[PDB]
Amino acid sequence: YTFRCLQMSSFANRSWSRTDSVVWLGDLQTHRWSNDSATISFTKPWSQGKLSNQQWEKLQHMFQVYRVSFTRDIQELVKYPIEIQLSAGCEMYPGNASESFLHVAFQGKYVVRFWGTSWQTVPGAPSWLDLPIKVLNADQGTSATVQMLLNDTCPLFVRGLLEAGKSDLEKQEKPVAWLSSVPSSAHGHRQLVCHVSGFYPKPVWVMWMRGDQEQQGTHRGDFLPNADETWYLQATLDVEAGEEAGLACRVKHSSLGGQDIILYW
Amino acid sequence: QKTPQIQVYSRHPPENGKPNILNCYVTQFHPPHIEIQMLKNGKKIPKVEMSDMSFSKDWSFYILAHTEFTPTETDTYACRVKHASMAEPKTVYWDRD
Numbered sequence A: 001y002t003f004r005c006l007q008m009s010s011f012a013n014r015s016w017s018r019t020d021s022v023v024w025l026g027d028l029q030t031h032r033w034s035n036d037s038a039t040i041s042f043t044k045p046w047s048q049g050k051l052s053n054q055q056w057e058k059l060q061h062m063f064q065v066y067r068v069s070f071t072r073d074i075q076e077l078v079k080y081p082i083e084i085q086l087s088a089g090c091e092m093y094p095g096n097a098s099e100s101f102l103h104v105a106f107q108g109k110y111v112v113r114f115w116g117t118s119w120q121t122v123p124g125a126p127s128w129l130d131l132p133i134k135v136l137n138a139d140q141g142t143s144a145t146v147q148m149l150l151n152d153t154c155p156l157f158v159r160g161l162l163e164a165g166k167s168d169l170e171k172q173e174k175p176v177a178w179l180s181s182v183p184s185s186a187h188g189h190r191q192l193v194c195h196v197s198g199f200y201p202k203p204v205w206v207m208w209m210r211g212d213q214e215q216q217g218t219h220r221g222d223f224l225p226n227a228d229e230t231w232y233l234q235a236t237l238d239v240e241a242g243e244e245a246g247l248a249c250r251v252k253h254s255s256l257g258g259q260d261i262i263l264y265w
Numbered sequence B: 001q002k003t004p005q006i007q008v009y010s011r012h013p014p015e016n017g018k019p020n021i022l023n024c025y026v027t028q029f030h031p032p033h034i035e036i037q038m039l040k041n042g043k044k045i046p047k048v049e050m051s052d053m054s055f056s057k058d059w060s061f062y063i064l065a066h067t068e069f070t071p072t073e074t075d076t077y078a079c080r081v082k083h084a085s086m087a088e089p090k091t092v093y094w095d096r097d
């Protein structure tokens, strides 16, 4: 599981800026924090994890001060349109192991990370960042706080989320599939489409088949989100008209027990 | 600066006359400022819900719009996007097939 906190800050000029944040645990949103809101909003029953109200309030306060300081520091540095994104969190591995990260992009490009005990520019980042990053590193209060958040608080908080959020994280939702076709660009050919929607979790197997034989022309699309915390995917096959007979789409998913969906064209 | 990609798809198998949900998934764009409309027969659908703006590992932004709809033999549905990266709004039509 990758836990990520995403910050999106836009500065249009000296007197217009906003920052919005969202937080994900794998593919499930756990928090939102609008520019218009003083406080971080929960998007799950279990968004506080195992933290007490006191621990949560202390954490939220730290972020409230950060959001204000960050905006002031950027407007100060700029002495437009500027887009800054920050992605921070941790990847949780089997056996209580984790790895934390904090990356920053400027104008859509990765330029800075926090690594170990300091802020570092990435090779290729513009040279004008070297000095402000130096100055930032002089702020040992901030460096120590970031170290604690990354090394300590992040994995601790996520362990709690994983417990508290068990019934959602471990949910199984069954795919429903259906078949369609369109003419292809190419006289006498058709594109067959197998649509698979409503499944959770994400891992799925979808193949066009002729009997036991996988059709290697099967072209899987991207995973597309539904609005109800389930997934959508389609897989297409270009066929010569005539050759359509005998084809099936087969889908395997954890929620199906061990009974694959097979639809026949 | 990156141009939005748009994909339009239904939550459930479409059946004419049966209520469903139409999704418009907009991806790969930068900057995050975007306008997304969903249209029925060329007219704006008033009740459209939007996900919170988020971004991927490659830093590009994405957003999911969705609306209740009931497919019909003759009604056309589309998702129309305006973004700084494009001189003209981009429209993609839902195609059940």
Ligand SMILES: CCCCCCCCCCCCCCC[C@@H](O)[C@H](CO[C@H]1O[C@H](C(=O)O)[C@H](O)[C@H](O)[C@H]1O)NC(=O)CCCCCCCCCCCCC
Binding pocket: A005, A006, A007, A021, A062, A063, A065, A066, A067, A069, A070, A073, A074, A077, A078, A082, A084, A086, A087, A088, A104, A105, A106, A111, A112, A139, A140, A141, A142, A145, A146
């Ligand atoms: C054209 C501009 C391009 C910029 C390019 C990118 C810039 C790199 C971005 C580097 C991040 C800037 C961090 C600055 C934050 C500090 O100003 C802030 C305030 O520091 C002051 O107050 C502190 C306090 O009261 O807590 C300390 O006392 C400190 O000594 C004092 O100087 N520091 C903090 O708020 C500390 C904790 C912040 C954690 C930073 C990571 C947050 C990421 C969380 C994920 C998303 C959250 C929305």
Ligand SMILES: *[C@@H]1O[C@H](CO)[C@@H](O[C@@H]2O[C@H](CO)[C@@H](O)[C@H](O)[C@H]2NC(C)=O)[C@H](O)[C@H]1NC(C)=O
Binding pocket: A115, A116, A117, A147, A148, A151
């Ligand atoms: C947070 O973890 C980082 C990464 O392990 C620590 O930075 C390391 O500190 C050790 C021990 O002093 C050094 O030997 C390494 O050089 C540092 N690692 C890297 C990759 O830079 C950091 O000290 C930890 N901070 C806290 C407060 O626990």
Ligand SMILES: CCCCCCCCCCCCCCCC(=O)O
Binding pocket: A005, A006, A021, A022, A023, A031, A032, A033, A040, A059, A063, A088, A089, A102, A145, A146, A147, A149, A150, A153, A154, A157
């Ligand atoms: C150095 C900052 C890195 C961020 C890691 C944060 C670890 C604490 C986890 C608390 C996350 C709760 C969501 C709040 C974050 C937000 O709203 O932006």
Ligand SMILES: *[C@@H]1O[C@H](CO)[C@@H](O)[C@H](O)[C@H]1NC(C)=O
Binding pocket: A012, A013, A014, A015, A016
């Ligand atoms: C700053 O940007 C905002 C939002 O784009 C805009 O409304 C405002 O006119 C700008 N202010 C100035 C001084 O140009």
Ligand SMILES: *[C@@H]1O[C@H](CO)[C@@H](O)[C@H](O)[C@H]1NC(C)=O
Binding pocket: A016, A017, A018, A019, A035, A036
């Ligand atoms: C975002 O919130 C800040 C702090 O409350 C506020 O000053 C600013 O006007 C808000 N941004 C916008 C564009 O609404």
